Ligand binder design. Structure first.
Ligand SMILES: [Cl-]
Length: 214
């Protein structure tokens, strides 16, 4: 039998990947400089003057940025075969999509970009994730994200988990008043080391849906 990709997802074009990557780095530099962030350092880290977040997020994706749909590990991951055999997955393979980025976020584990999927794109979102959005009362695909960085001991799956936690809080209405205004939008302090920049203008990135084999 044919084995499957390591994972499926939307791979950003070089140009869109660079645009988003650079914006994410600028966000880390702006956030680390912000007085609201510096004030809350004890809830972010356990050791001490200034924390450079670019250094803190010391593992970054090495190639182009991507929005993962289904991790398959060549067939060895749960639900991989069922995902890959879907008509819509085969139909979409190699095809171009536009992804809407609505927010950048930081936690003590990850730095990411929130993706708001279209209905057509949601058809490619897996229905069997460990800790699916629906398990927390959120719409499927809510945790779609592009990972921009993570801390030394952190794994890729963490970014979507962190986003789900942030979105659950906003749902609770504990987003709070903005604590600052950055060039690209309002900054929110969600507690427990968690920060969100809500973009005034959503960032559209071009991507191709396909399979990565490593
Ligand atoms: Cl989900």
């Amino acid at each position: 039998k044919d084995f499957l990709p390591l994972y499926f997802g939307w791979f950003l074009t070089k140009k869109s990947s660079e645009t988003l990557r650079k914006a994410g780095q600028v966000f880390l530099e702006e956030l680390g400089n912000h007085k609201a962030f510096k004030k809350e350092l004890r809830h972010f880290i356990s050791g001490d003057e200034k924390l450079e977040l670019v250094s803190y997020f010391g593992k970054r994706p090495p190639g182009v940025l991507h929005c993962t749909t289904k991790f398959c590990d060549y067939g060895k991951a749960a639900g991989a075969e069922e995902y890959a055999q879907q008509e819509v997955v085969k139909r979409s393979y190699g095809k171009a999509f536009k992804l809407s980025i609505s927010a950048l976020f930081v936690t003590p584990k990850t730095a990411g970009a929130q993706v708001v999927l279209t209905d057509q794109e949601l058809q490619l979102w897996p229905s069997d994730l460990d800790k699916p959005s629906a398990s927390e009362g959120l719409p499927p695909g809510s945790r779609a994200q592009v990972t921009l960085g993570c801390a030394a001991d952190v794994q890729p799956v963490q970014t979507g988990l962190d986003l789900l936690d942030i979105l659950q809080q906003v749902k609770g209405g504990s987003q709070g008043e903005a604590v600052g205004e950055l060039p690209r939008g309002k900054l929110y302090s969600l507690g427990k080391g968690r920060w969100m920049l809500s973009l005034t203008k959503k960032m559209e990135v071009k991507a191709i849906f396909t399979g990565y084999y490593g």
